[PDB]
């Protein structure tokens, strides 16, 4: 199901994909600079960006020069998710999408300023 999950690729400054998570109305995102992992085993970065607006898991196209988000916006995957667990540094969610299926997890860095999370598919 009922929440939603949505990839975007987006093609900014650099490429990469914004992973987003529905949460209490908004859509809660993170900056992955490469693409989300489809199998347990591999570990990405993910920078927590701003909310979104839950219109956005629709939107493909082009945010003009000089915008928040400016680039070129694809749906690289969309779907629906159960919440398993969410704590201020930690999340963890099974995700039903077309390239994204089972249990992702989020969990934020202890370590550094504003600190990154690490974003992986469990081993199940
Ligand atoms: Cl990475
Ligand atoms: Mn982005």
Redesign the pocket.
Known sequence: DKPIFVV?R?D?RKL???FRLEMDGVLKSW?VPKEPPKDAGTRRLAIE?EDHPLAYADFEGEIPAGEY?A?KVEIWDRGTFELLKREEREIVVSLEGKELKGIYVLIRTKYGGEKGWLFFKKAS
Do not use: C, M, P, V
Request: proline letters at 0%; charged letters at 10%; glycine letters at 20%.
């Open positions: 975007q987006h900014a990469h994909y914004d900056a960006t988000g680039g």
